[PDB]
Subunit: 496 residues, 4 copies
């Protein structure tokens, strides 16, 4: 509550904290108790346009795009140091807004620091290449330039984390940006803008728009002055964005959902498999893009595994994120909880079984909050919607498989391909499986490990492009081939 | 004419030369005299789908995708050797179909050979990277895999050249492909498929669909089994394709048009500037994506330059591509010539001047052909359509500029950004200019120089992605991060 | 006295001409199977070596090859690769005739050599440097890769053409001029490849072949001031000598020396696989391989069982003529080398080891005239002995036990060398842990002898300096230049006007 | 002023740093450190023995093998190198004064070093976790091929006296970023800033044995640092004759080497150059730090059409160069480092006169009253010389430049390359195309077009020919501290069955 007394309630456009053009506002909720904890501006589409034009003017002036890469690196680094300095407050603020446990939030702040630090160090390392020209008396070189103006749109599950992944490289490369976080979770994003302002950037280089996607999203994807749209969210929105971006042939980077398999062989460390299955399915109430919602367990240990899992699920401590006992918090909103509830109806209707959970808890201390019980769904198959679609809640499905080939076939029988895992003490087997899985990230005997050093993104419909690592940086760069003819001669093709 | 007696008239699907599903056909024209010279199959949308499903089956069997990169390289190299072996016939065939001069066609065959040779040698050079994991007791690696099934669509101006740019990397990486050339120029594309078949590839690895984009194009961009659409064509079609590809969040590579500036300073080698201005504007009747249709000349030499240019334009030899005297051939079709003619009306209507040309030649020997006189348009400015839009004909516009900053501003005052040139003996100045031009390729004291060793593509609306060079190869690859935990421990987050 | 030799040159190739030794001296080349003279070649002088080097310099400076486009240089290296394949059969027979190894082992080399030239042919036009984001405003910073210049290349006798391919390919791909000198006792295939390269066509002086003893012309090739790089593959004592001499003109060096390569076998290894590969590692080409698995480390729980299985197999190894399909192991290269091996048997016995099998010349009738030596297995030895620490380079292996994984690693690394080694175990996780702790340039897991152009090869510790093959291999033949242009120069005005 | 300089020394260690402890020489022997401005002893430090060097090397080995640093995550190693960078900036002022006190160069030149050093550590800190090897597309089916980059192991690092901390930063940063253990030995006559940086690195915190500092004469402990068998790499920056000796000794255990030796760096000036700019940079190139710079532009090549005009402009400017104390703001050029070095320079003036050259200005000690007690030597210009002379071919390493004429572009290139060296050089001309042609033909590691002395961590530095072996700075700089390992796994092993059963 203390955190909020000095926190800005406004958008940041062209170097000034400013209200919505129509002074409209929005109430921010704390999912633990559904109480309004803060009120922020609700920007208009004209505000978004003004920010974009500001980013363009700034980009063209060259104050940031022509700054030395080394210096750009030092500034991104300064932002990283600010995350660490205000680690505590930021973590609490994220837990307050999103509802996840405090330790999960501390972990984010550690990642975020490393994300900024990674890109800060990557800034001055590769400015292009020299080519051995196949034409005599010519010099051929490729120079990497910042792509230009970029719009950045994030989801509500991990607001600052997803923002760090976009901001760091944009700044490291010299781009100008316009960021818009999920309308329902802008607290940490506002805070980071306050921090970036302290670090100091040229007027127009960074901008923050606050508002509903349905209202200002189309401007951010479709305005002609935008050179790249980096979006992290739902698949249906991603498609809409791509279609809109096509109007001005605008580059896109999409980080969409997943139906991530968690493959468990009978030769896996059993207690390890159970631990990580619980983790994969219930961290942040399964509101994770890399969530292991699709468990694939080998028939020989399926029954044994289902029992062990269900027992553990019955003991999961639900509660307030600020409370150390809490193992799983609430889901983000009434709308989202309802979406999850309607999936339980869908699953039952198509023949699946709700082995445990699948309802709101009625325990007294949880009644006022947006809680939903950790759930396990059994007796399902690949043809069902509950198995194919991203529920994005504390829910997992269990499917059996006889052989290694069948496990692969099933893991890939999905429109998505973001991430997955394989558990087995036979490392050679796990390796074979990993090579055949059409997934952007594959974990062997682990789950949820991502880091700035390596690219993250999807195969198939989980996305287009990548974030993090060297490839992450590349989305914010464009190549130019400059060829100089050191001994120019007339071609004399046309008559004299 | 001899060339055509043994040339296939059919599509190539799943290892067999086959007719259209409805046995429909199309007549191919020779723009020099407008006579039908060949008849080919006109595929249906069901044929396109069948080819795509075939490419998928092939990709999944692994006969090509799992072949060693080294071997894949040897096969792409074998294709390169076939281009050189049949260099003569291919060149004649391209001149027959597209109408350009024979020497311009020989040049293509030399480039095409080098394109295949370049990618053949690039195939086994980079299979990913090893990462220094920030987490102890873990192994982190990134593997590059072929993206999967790719659809390739080409234009009519340089049919085989544009195809070579797509086929070479697709094959080098292990992808399966479905190619569809411009419905009006399929001759050389059919031939190269005959040649690739001789080299030998697994059933389904390569497929050729023949037909109108309006008929089968949507299947090639929108079918769910497609992992990448590589398109080279007009901007309006590119947007349509991107929008359609969005339905299954399909990657895209777009190589669209340009309004390429040819900047000439008063300190340029005058006779060199004139030579290259003629070249830039009239090679292949200005039907080149890199055509220098927008001449920007410095005011101090504008009048002198306009005279020199106009005199040379009056002497340009028009005629049959097979005739050595010929300097400029006809335009590709009655439809295209009409689009060009309507632009002359547009230009006159908006205040510009047709300083020379702007009409069909009435000379006896050219009357039956699709010729159009080389044209020079003066007294125009950046606000006019004739200057902003891609005419794609033997037409150039001349604009003056006082200073270096004004030249840059004008060169960039366009929705496009594919390529351009700068002429000046002050190499330092030319370099400054090159750095400020938002163009994918910038030539200093030269024009039209492109090659496999360097990436080609556009800034802004001239495209998305790149072709040729290492970046060209990357459009056909996808990254996977495989992280192994060599000493897995339970996290024990949840209760026991 | 076969067909291959009737049209083969007997001379050096200097500055575009096949020429005799300056003093017309010559040398007789032997076939180790029967010790008969099969060919006579020129024996160059140190003045001939100097003349070739000066020729390489003149050629390098004229730019006809160093300024050719990388793409074209690639096409020419590719043309050489095609020639290796075209004359695959003859080259393989010629190598078997000169070195004594089996024909199939020679066919395998010709396949690698082709792929070596092909790899570098494709690598030639792929990386010409980098563009740097300058920390100084109004400046352009770029790094350009240039051919290092004149390079001398010296090879051993075990795999003459293979070792030559590894040096020639990158030198030519990069634009360097070279002077090659093969082992004085095995120049046949090297001469042939020069004939083939000449057919491909290169500028006068770009390639040169010197024939002669290292003791005579080697010092010129490592110590002449016009040499920019010495690439040497041979024995450790010669490598040291070369490095010391190269220091006179601060000349770069690339050294590919010997090894005491461990073949680690755990009790959870595929037993029959381990035995197969142990035999292979120790006896291919009579153990005359730089990557030979002469130091077998077997886990105590299966040591006795493994020693028996190995010894039985060794007793059945078919020795004979390389051209004969039955032959599994040929002779050693020379009387001198066989004597070196025999003296090691005395050393081993003297320091307490046991010759469990072999350790002598075979007296079988059909082998008496040849330079044969029986495949040998030495037991009851430990790391403190010379027979275990030093490179014997013959058909000899030592067997040592180890109790734990840490002890296997400690022993595998208890050596002055670090070229290559292997680990056998069905527990891939364990094999991976071990591989990470082995100070070796190449580590094989459940395999042996796998090398290829796509990956760098070379040693840790005293097995060498630098690398061959892969991108790093190419880099030995390149030098970096940083060109920094100030696009808006201002006076600094540090000193008084 | 200079006072803040002497204060610096009251808290500075006087000892070697071996295996986590500040310790004296094994024989308690010591050495006096001089301030070249007045030749007064300003500090006394330990003078290590060869046994001390060996003990440090064995300590580095033990540490390397324990894996506390070599197995730390690259990311963390980066953070620590970054912490060192932050310490350079924090103590920027004191370090700069200390370097000026010890080496004699101006305070501003020292501030510049501290700025570079900070950036050097920062660069490598950010490079630490960026490339851990590559995955190869194996030509053999059912196999996985990967190349892992590992720290090379134990490294010995030896630096010169002209830019002590700068040359040390170039070696320490990558060694630490990569996970190597190191043993550093600075020039026996300039150990002040090197000792200080070790105090700072100790504060940052590193495992026992990871870093070690040996103090002593090269003639005494140098052979152990290059020839001990446990050393995996010797990184040396110094004179050519010492480099050759080191290489020869390193050969005993086939030990890798990185050598950064001298230069005879050409400063080429065409008649179409910005004349006043050419003169400014010619002065800079020849006299910064009294020409005691490895990249010094001691060989001026000026085009015949403007040679006479240039010689006069240069000489006039040389007569006005302000000599004095490094701590005094007026000072433009300080003294040379030692009586031995000044004598070496003086003997070169005799050499030049004897072989026919002309001492157009300077070539003597200044007799001005305030400079008499210091190791000063007048900025000198030598004319009427040619490529065959020793004064032109050899590295004088003093405030001396030679002027040679050239008629054509080809002649300029020929002369610039007529030298055993190839470290760096410059080209001045407004015709950028011409300057580019020239730059491509110069056998030099770094070539400046219309500038001089520009080096930075982002780009590799080193020589062609006898100016060295290997590179420092940039990605290539890091690679000297790494070794490649190819791990090939056969995922479906089969018996070869070559031998009978
Ligand atoms: N950027 C470059 O590298 C480059 C190179 C050459 C040409 N071009 C551009 O190409 C254009 C000229 O070629 P064009 O007139 O054939 O272009 P176009 O868009 O008119 O047609 C190109 C291709 O698209 C296909 N097509 C049409 N509708 C389609 C649909 N709905 N879905 C899928 N495919 C469809 C056609 O069959 C044809 O093969 C010009 O704009 C020119 O500047 C660009």
């Amino acid at each position: 509550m203390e955190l909020l007394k000095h926190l800005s309630q406004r958008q940041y456009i062209d170097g000034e904290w400013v209200e919505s053009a129509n002074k409209n506002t929005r109430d921010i909720i704390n999912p633990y108790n559904q109480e309004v904890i803060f009120t922020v501006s609700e920007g208009t589409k004209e505000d978004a346009e003004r920010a974009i034009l500001a980013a363009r003017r700034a980009f063209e002036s060259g104050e940031w795009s022509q700054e030395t890469a080394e210096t750009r690196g030092k500034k991104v680094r300064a932002i990283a140091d600010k995350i660490k300095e205000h680690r505590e407050a930021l973590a609490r603020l994220e837990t307050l807004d999103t509802g996840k446990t405090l330790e999960e939030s501390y972990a984010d702040m550690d990642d975020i620091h490393n994300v900024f630090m990674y890109f800060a160090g990557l800034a001055d390392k590769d400015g292009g290449e020299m080519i051995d020209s196949p034409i005599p008396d010519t010099e051929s070189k490729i120079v990497k330039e910042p792509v230009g103006v970029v719009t950045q749109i994030t989801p509500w599950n991990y607001p600052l984390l997803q923002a760090s992944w976009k901001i760091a490289p944009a700044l490291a490369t010299g781009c100008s940006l316009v960021m818009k976080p999920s309308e329902i979770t802008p607290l940490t994003t506002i805070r980071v803008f306050e921090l970036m302002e302290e670090v100091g950037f040229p007027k127009g280089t960074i901008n923050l728009i606050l508002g509903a996607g349905s209202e200002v999203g189309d401007v951010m994807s479709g305005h002609k002055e935008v050179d790249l749209v980096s979006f992290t969210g739902g698949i249906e929105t991603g498609k809409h964005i791509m279609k809109n971006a096509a109007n001005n042939v605008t580059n896109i980077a999409l980080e969409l959902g997943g139906k991530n398999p968690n493959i468990i062989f009978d030769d896996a460390d059993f207690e390890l498999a159970v631990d990580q299955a619980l983790n994969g399915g219930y961290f942040h109430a399964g509101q994770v893009c890399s969530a292991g919602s699709r468990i694939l367990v080998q028939n020989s240990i399926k029954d044994k595994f289902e029992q062990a899992l269900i027992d553990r699920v019955k003991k999961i401590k639900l509660g307030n994120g600020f409370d150390a006992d809490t193992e799983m918090g609430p889901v983000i909103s009434t709308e989202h909880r309802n979406k999850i509830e309607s999936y339980m109806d869908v699953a039952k209707a198509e023949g699946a079984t709700i082995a445990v959970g699948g309802k709101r808890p009625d325990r007294d201390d949880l009644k006022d909050g947006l809680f939903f019980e950790p759930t396990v769904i059994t007796n399902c198959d690949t043809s069902m919607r509950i198995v194919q679609e991203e529920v994005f809640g504390p829910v997992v499905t269990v499917e059996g498989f006889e052989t290694e080939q069948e496990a692969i076939q099933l893991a890939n029988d999905s429109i998505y391909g973001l991430a997955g895992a394989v558990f087995s003490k036979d490392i050679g087997k796990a390796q074979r499986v990993a090579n055949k899985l059409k997934l952007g990230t594959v974990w062997i005997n682990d789950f949820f490990m991502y880091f700035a050093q390596a690219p993250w993104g999807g195969y198939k419909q989980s996305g287009i492009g990548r974030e993090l690592g060297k490839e992450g940086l590349e989305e914010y760069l464009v190549s130019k081939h400059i060829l100089t003819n050191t001994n120019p001669q007339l071609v004399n093709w046309f008559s004299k």
